[PDB]
C-alpha cells in the first residue's frame, strides 16, 4: 500500500520488545519502505493460501500474542536485508532490491518454514516441537538465503546439490544470527525449537552427529528420504564451515580457523561465482579454494584452512 513510513513497536516470539517500520494508510501495515522495494509481512490466517493479507493494524502497537510471529518475521527480514547489503554489498535476494514478502500463521500446527520460489512461509508450529518458527533469526535468514541461492548458483533441491543449498542457508543462517548478535551459536533453531526442553536444536554446525546428522563424507546418507537427505548431509558441509571459521581437530585433521567474516566472504563469493545448479561437494571445495585464492592469494592461511576443513570432512 502506498502510504506513510512510520515506526511501530511490538513483542517478538520470545516476548522481547523491538521496533518495526510500518506503513500508515488508514491502517498501519507491516510494510517496511526503508529497505529496497519493500519488506511486506502477511497474515495467512491459519489457511494454506498465500501470501494471505498484507498484515494491517489499527494502532501500530503489536503486543498481541497473535502478532508475535509477524513482528518477528518483519523485523528479521529487515536485519537479514541489512546483513546482505552491509556485509556483502548486495540488494535483497535478487541483488536488485526485490520485495521480501513473508506470510505468517501458515496453516494450523505447521512445524516448518519455507521459501516457495517467491516468498518465505512460517507456521506457528504446534507448541511442543516448535513455537512460531520466525521466532528464530537463523530460521528466518536460512530461508531468505534460499532465495539468494535460487537467484545466484541455483543449486538444485536434491542429493549432494540440495545439501550444499541447505548448508548454504545454515551457514548464512548463523552469519545473520551472529550479525544481529544476541546469544549467537552454531546451532540451528534453538530459539523456536522444543519449548520446555532447553539447550537442544534442529541441527548442530559445531557437531552435526550430535543430532544424528553426518560429519564426514564417509558417513553420508545415500538414500532418498528428505530428497536425497538434503537436511541430513548438509552437516558435512556445515562442519567444514564451522571448522573453517572456528578451527579444531576433526577425525585427526587439524584446522586453523580464520573467523566468520572471512567465512562468509569465501562462501558468498563461491555461491555468487563458481557454484552451478549441479555442484556436488567436490566442486564446492573447488569453489571455496578458488574464492579464498582470489580474496586472499594462492598461499594464504585462508586457502590452506579451507583445504584443511574439506580434508577434515573427507571431501576430495
Write down the catalytic residue from 74, 88, 231, 250.
231
Q: Which three cell numbers stand for residue 100?
A: 521480501
User: Which positions from 175 through 194 interact with Ca ion, judged by CB under 5 A?
Assistant: 177, 183, 185, 187, 190, 193-194
* Residue 210 CA: distances (Å) to CA of 133, 143, 202, 215, 218: 22, 23, 10, 9, 17
DSSP-assigned letters across all residues of 89-142: ---TTTTS---EEEEES-SSS---EEE-SS-EEE----SSSBS-GGGSHHHHHH
- The answer to whether residue 226 forms part of the interface with Ca ion (CB under 5 A) is no
Window of 54-62, 151-159, 240-248, 295-303 that interacts with Ca ion by CB under 5 A: 54-62
The contact mask relative to Ca ion for 96-135 (x = CB under 5 A, - = no) is ----------------------------------------
Please state, in angstroms and rounded to a whole number, the distance separating the CA atoms of residues 255 and 186.
17
Catalytic, 119? Answer no
- Nearest residue to 260 (alpha-carbon basis) of 316, 314, 201, 179: 179
Please state, in angstroms and rounded to a whole number, the distance separating the CA atoms of residues 80 and 291.
23
- The answer to whether residue 197 forms part of the interface with Ca ion (CB under 5 A) is yes
Q: Which three cell numbers stand for residue 104?
A: 505468517
- The answer to whether residue 59 forms part of the interface with Ca ion (CB under 5 A) is yes
What is the distance between the terminal CA atoms of the chain, rounded to a whole angstrom? 52
User: Applying CB under 5 A, what is the total number of residues that bind Ca ion?
Assistant: 12
Map residue 216 onto helix, strand or coil: coil
Among 32, 119, 124, 138, binds Ca ion (CB under 5 A): 138
- The answer to whether residue 26 forms part of the interface with Ca ion (CB under 5 A) is no
Give min distance, CB of 191 to Ca ion, in A. Answer: 6
- CB nearest Ca ion: which residue? 194
Catalytic, 231? Answer yes
Binding site for Ca ion (CB under 5 A): 57, 59, 138, 177, 183, 185, 187, 190, 193-194, 197, 200
Catalytic residues: 143, 231
User: Binding site: residue ranges?
Assistant: 57, 59, 61, 138, 142, 146, 166, 177, 183, 185, 187, 190-191, 193-194, 197, 200, 211
Amino acid at each position: 500500500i502506498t502510504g506513510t513510513s512510520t515506526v511501530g513497536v511490538g513483542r517478538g516470539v520470545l516476548g522481547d520488545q523491538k521496533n518495526i517500520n510500518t506503513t500508515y494508510s488508514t491502517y498501519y501495515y507491516l510494510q517496511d519502505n526503508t529497505r529496497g522495494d519493500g519488506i511486506f509481512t502477511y497474515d495467512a490466517k491459519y489457511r494454506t493460501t498465500l501470501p494471505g493479507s498484507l498484515w494491517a493494524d489499527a494502532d501500530n502497537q503489536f503486543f498481541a500474542s497473535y502478532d508475535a510471529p509477524a513482528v518477528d518475521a518483519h523485523y528479521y527480514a529487515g536485519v537479514t536485508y541489512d546483513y546482505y547489503k552491509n556485509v556483502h554489498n548486495r540488494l535483497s535476494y535478487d541483488g536488485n532490491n526485490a520485495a521480501i514478502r513473508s506470510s505468517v500463521h501458515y496453516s494450523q500446527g505447521y512445524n516448518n518454514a519455507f521459501w516457495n520460489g517467491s516468498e518465505m512461509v512460517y507456521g506457528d508450529g504446534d507448541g511442543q516441537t516448535f513455537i512460531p518458527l520466525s521466532g528464530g533469526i537463523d530460521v528466518v535468514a536460512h530461508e531468505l538465503t534460499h532465495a539468494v541461492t535460487d537467484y545466484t548458483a541455483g543449486l538444485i533441491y536434491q542429493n549432494e546439490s540440495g545439501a550444499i543449498n541447505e548448508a548454504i542457508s545454515d551457514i548464512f543462517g548463523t552469519l545473520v544470527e551472529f550479525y544481529a548478535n544476541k546469544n549467537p551459536d552454531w546451532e540451528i533453531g534453538e530459539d523456536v525449537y522444543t519449548p520446555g526442553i532447553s539447550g537442544d536444536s534442529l541441527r548442530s554446525m559445531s557437531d552435526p552427529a550430535k543430532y544424528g546428522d553426518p560429519d564426514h563424507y564417509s558417513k553420508r546418507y545415500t538414500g532418498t528420504q528428505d530428497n536425497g537427505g538434503v537436511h541430513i548431509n548438509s552437516g558435512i558441509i556445515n562442519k567444514a564451515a564451522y571448522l573453517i571459521s572456528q578451527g579444531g581437530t576433526h577425525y585427526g585433521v587439524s584446522v586453523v580457523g580464520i573467523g566468520r567474516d572471512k567465512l562468509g566472504k569465501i562462501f558468498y563469493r563461491a555461491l555468487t561465482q563458481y557454484l552451478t545448479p549441479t555442484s556436488n561437494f567436490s566442486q564446492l571445495r573447488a569453489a571455496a579454494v578458488q574464492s579464498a585464492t582470489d580474496l586472499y592469494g594462492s598461499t594464504s592461511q585462508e586457502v590452506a584452512s579451507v583445504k584443511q576443513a574439506f580434508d577434515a570432512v573427507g571431501v576430495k
